[PDB]
Design a protein around this ligand. Structure first.
Ligand SMILES: *[C@@H]1O[C@H](CO)[C@@H](O[C@@H]2O[C@H](CO)[C@@H](O)[C@H](O)[C@H]2NC(C)=O)[C@H](O)[C@H]1NC(C)=O
Ligand SMILES: *[C@@H]1O[C@H](CO)[C@@H](O)[C@H](O)[C@H]1NC(C)=O
Lengths: 50, 337, 375, 42, 49, 101
């Protein structure tokens, strides 16, 4: 799961809603997690620019 | 002529013909003299009377022949395969004939391949007519493939060599199989020793330089030296006249041959004006056509044409052999009659 | 101003001056109708190739400068014993150093001096890409010059073996025989009469094999030789009759050149009649010449060398080409023009040769004058 | 980006396809003959 | 005759006799001479690269 | 008959010639295609604003010129740029490989 802003153009007030993410990195994240015993609660960024 | 120290003293003098001019043996240098900083320090140069640059020179690569008549396109195995398969389909035809004209069938197939109009048999048995169609198809296929890959052979040309210039890394980290060369004590040498980067190759260059041009030319003709570096407006003519050598592409530093006079003679501006007026009235170019661009050996290393009797051997010999090998069997068969 | 050498550009509307890597081009423009009271200062900034060579020289011999554009005309043509443009401003009004894109002739050298040139150049021609090919006798070209007749005589030979051999073994004439043969070589596309003797039956099939090799070979060679063709520019050189006697042809060429330049005032002293004929076109600017050359209004163009070679490597597609292999017809060079007989001359000259020693001219060239086409 | 190979002599390496087409033709043809025969006497 | 014509008239055949058909086949012959040349050309091309 | 053979051979030959000569140059080379150092106002680059690429440019000195030509068009994010080069509204896009591939 990932909590993050809706309406990626955030000029209008953002609604921090939950979506879900999946791809090439978060799996790697999971690998690390099961490697070093810690939890996590991801969430996207506000501004969108790096 | 260049500059150098002498007698292990603080005297730096000028070897060579430029030095001669400096001392008072003559008062004009009319020859293919170059232009550069050092020389331009104390000598007055006319306006440039011919523009050019440096370039490279290598022994022309050797091409591939017309062909051996039948070698290139097929392997012998293919010939054998088709040769047997002919009689194969022939006997199968004859079987489909008898089971429900042999000397006919051999003709039929051999013709179907050879496209010769001769022959009068046919497949009587519907069983065989089902086969003959695809047999002919196979024939067309094979002959088409043949012509196609002969075409493929005749158009793909030779590999890379193309020494590019001052940047072909075959010239920055010389393996000890390459050998450059320039004429000692020559403008080129000055252009190198003063540059800082190129220094490395300079040393690799040092242990081989020659005495003059003709020696270098004759020494790269016979393979005793890979590459030669020199001034274009000599190399171009040289390649044009004798045509188993070639230049490669790039230029180095564009400079111009000019007349040279001692420091502030009262003759400068007249000479310069005359040179310019000459360049305007085409007279210079009349000289050009009369002495430079008169002869042309080959070029365009594509060379995509011009096959001749070299092909004709492998096939004309075959037809003459057919002639001479007919008569014996003719006598044999008229005896068998 | 000049397209590839001295590019002009207006200031950035934020600061007041423009970006780095350029020099301010002051005092450009004056009044037009009311009163001069010269404002001049519409300051813009310029950059390119010649500007860079100037900057490096400035750093290499200590001095300063300030750069201002020109009004009265162009490069400058001696008119009524007086000089317009840059030369004018460097004779009387004491500009004291002209730069940019000047040629070098005799006249101009009779008034001002000149440094050592730094780019080869001269007169050259430019034509639309000769859309099409040249293959007038392609079909006769390949596969031989002679072996045709060798096959011919081999054929006439095998005819005799045919007649003799087929005469002795178990309506056959030399005419029908050679007929069948000559029909076979090209393609068995002819209703013929075949022999009957088994001897000859074999004796011909070998020749048939010969034919099927021959034909495939020939077609392959033709395909090859037609793959790697070569363009041939449809004009030889400036000396061609196709320029000498234009009227002698179907609608004669329509070629022009911007007037007042060095090129024209060169032309007018070698081919006066053709110069007069040229008066009917006298294209203006340069880009106008390009457009007119793209829309059939012209068919050849005569102008400086370098600027043309830069213009060639630019235009979209590659549909415009300089004649020959880039050959030039009046070898001279650009240069720097300084007021008559200041010592400065010598101190500048060495400077420029200095750059030829360190490849810096090659860097500059590769940074401005390269193109994409004609690689 | 070297251009490409320049093939030669075309050994049996590839013509296996055409030879297979030929042989399969022969097989199916004799098959059909035997079929037509066994049907014809019937 | 037809199947022989398409590939190459390398087969002893029997032709028709009606002028109607005489024309009616020559068009197909033209078809063949286009077909064959096309095919060979394409093979040559695809074998080049 | 000879003429016939000639013409049909020429035909097949130049059909072959047609089928093998391919398209012209475009091949924008990289940071050195001079179509990218003196931009005519028909080209438009783009990068994502405030992104690593932008930093790589502004700090380099030479490239500065194109930087300015680049400045007035940068986008908000990737997807916008992709979709905007699909429909021809923008010529070239610069970005990180392991996305572009
Ligand atoms: C070449 O120089 C002549 C010099 O006269 C230019 O002719 C002048 O142009 C101005 C303004 O365009 C006119 O007021 C003059 O009357 C023109 N002179 C004559 C004699 O008519 C001519 O324009 C120049 N050509 C180019 C291409 O710059
Ligand atoms: C040209 O001659 C003089 C310049 O030497 C000038 O005073 C005169 O007005 C000019 N006349 C014409 C017709 O150009």
């Amino acid at each position: 799961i990932c909590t993050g802003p809706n309406d990626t153009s955030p000029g209008s007030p953002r609604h921090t809603v939950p979506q879900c993410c999946y791809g090439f990195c978060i799996d790697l994240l999971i690998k690390l997690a099961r490697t070093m015993q810690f939890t996590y609660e991801v969430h996207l960024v506000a501004d969108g620019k790096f | 002529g260049t500059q150098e120290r002498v007698q292990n003293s603080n005297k730096k003098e000028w070897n060579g013909m430029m030095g001669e001019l400096l001392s008072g043996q003559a008062d004009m240098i009319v020859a293919p003299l170059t232009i550069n900083n050092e020389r331009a320090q104390y000598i007055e140069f006319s306006k440039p009377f011919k523009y050019q640059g440096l370039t490279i020179l290598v022994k022309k690569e050797i091409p591939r022949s017309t062909l051996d008549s039948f070698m290139q396109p097929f392997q012998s195995t293919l010939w054998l395969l088709v040769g047997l398969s002919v009689h194969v389909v022939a006997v199968m035809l004859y079987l489909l004939d008898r089971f429900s004209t042999l000397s006919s069938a051999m003709w039929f197939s051999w013709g179907v391949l050879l496209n010769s109009g001769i022959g009068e048999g046919a497949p009587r048995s519907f069983s065989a007519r089902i086969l003959g169609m695809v047999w002919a198809g196979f024939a067309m296929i094979i002959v088409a493939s043949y012509t196609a890959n002969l075409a493929a052979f005749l158009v793909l040309d030779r590999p890379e060599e193309r020494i590019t210039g001052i940047n072909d890394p075959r010239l920055r980290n010389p393996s000890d199989k390459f050998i450059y060369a320039t004429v000692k004590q020559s403008s080129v040498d000055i252009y190198f020793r003063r540059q800082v980067e190129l220094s490395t190759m300079y040393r690799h260059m040092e242990k081989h330089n020659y005495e003059s041009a003709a020696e270098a030319i004759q020494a790269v003709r016979d393979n005793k030296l890979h590459a030669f570096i020199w001034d274009s407006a000599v190399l171009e003519f040289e390649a044009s006249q004798k045509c188993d050598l070639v230049t490669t592409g790039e230029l180095f530093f564009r400079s111009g041959f000019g007349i040279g006079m001692r420091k502030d003679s009262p003759w400068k501006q007249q000479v310069s004006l005359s040179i310019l007026k000459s360049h305007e009235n085409g007279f210079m170019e009349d000289l050009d056509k009369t002495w430079v661009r008169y002869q042309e050996c080959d070029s365009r290393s594509n060379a995509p044409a011009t096959l001749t009797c070299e092909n004709m051997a492998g096939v004309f010999m075959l037809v003459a052999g057919g002639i001479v090998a007919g008569i014996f069997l003719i006598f044999i068969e008229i005896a068998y009659k | 101003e000049e397209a590839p050498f001295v590019i002009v550009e207006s200031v950035d509307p934020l600061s007041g001056t423009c970006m780095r890597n350029t020099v301010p081009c002051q005092k450009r423009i004056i009044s037009e109708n009311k009163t001069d009271e010269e404002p001049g200062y519409i300051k813009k900034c310029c950059k390119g190739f010649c500007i860079d060579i100037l900057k490096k020289i400035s750093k290499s011999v200590k001095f300063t400068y300030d750069l201002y554009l020109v009004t009265n005309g162009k490069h400058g043509k001696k008119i009524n014993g007086t000089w317009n443009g840059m030369i004018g401003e460097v004779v009387m009004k004491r500009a004291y150093m002209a730069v940019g894109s000047l040629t070098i002739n005799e006249e101009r050298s009779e008034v001002v001096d000149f440094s050592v040139p730094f780019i080869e150049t001269g007169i050259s021609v430019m034509v639309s890409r000769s859309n099409g090919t040249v293959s007038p006798s392609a079909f006769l070209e390949p596969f031989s010059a002679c072996v045709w007749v060798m096959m011919f005589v081999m054929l006439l030979i095998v005819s005799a073996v045919a007649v003799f051999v087929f005469e002795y073994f178990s309506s056959f004439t030399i005419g029908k025989a050679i007929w069948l043969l000559w029909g076979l070589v090209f393609n068995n596309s002819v209703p013929v009469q075949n022999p009957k003797g088994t001897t000859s039956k074999i004796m011909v099939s070998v020749w048939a094999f010969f034919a099927v090799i021959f034909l495939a070979s020939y077609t392959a060679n033709l395909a090859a030789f037609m793959i790697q063709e070569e363009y041939v520019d449809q004009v030889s050189g400036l000396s061609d009759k196709k320029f000498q006697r234009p009227n002698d042809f179907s609608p004669p060429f329509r070629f022009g050149t911007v007037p007042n330049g060095s090129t024209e005032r060169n032309i007018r002293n070698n081919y006066a009649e053709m110069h007069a004929y040229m008066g009917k076109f006298n294209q203006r600017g340069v880009d106008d010449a390009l457009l007119s050359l793209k829309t059939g209004k012209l068919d050849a163009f005569i102008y400086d060398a370098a600027v043309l070679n830069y213009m060639a490597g630019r235009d979209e597609g590659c549909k415009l080409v300089t004649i020959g292999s880039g050959k030039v017809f009046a070898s001279t060079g650009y240069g720097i023009a300084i007021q008559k007989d200041s010592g400065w001359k010598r101190q500048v000259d060495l400077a420029i040769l200095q750059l030829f020693g360190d490849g810096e001219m090659e860097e500059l060239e590769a940074l401005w004058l390269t193109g994409i086409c004609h690689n | 980006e070297k251009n490409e190979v320049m093939s030669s002599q075309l050994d049996i390496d590839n013509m296996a396809g055409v030879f297979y087409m030929l042989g399969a033709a022969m097989a199916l043809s004799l098959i059909t003959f035997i079929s037509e025969h066994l049907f014809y006497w019937q």
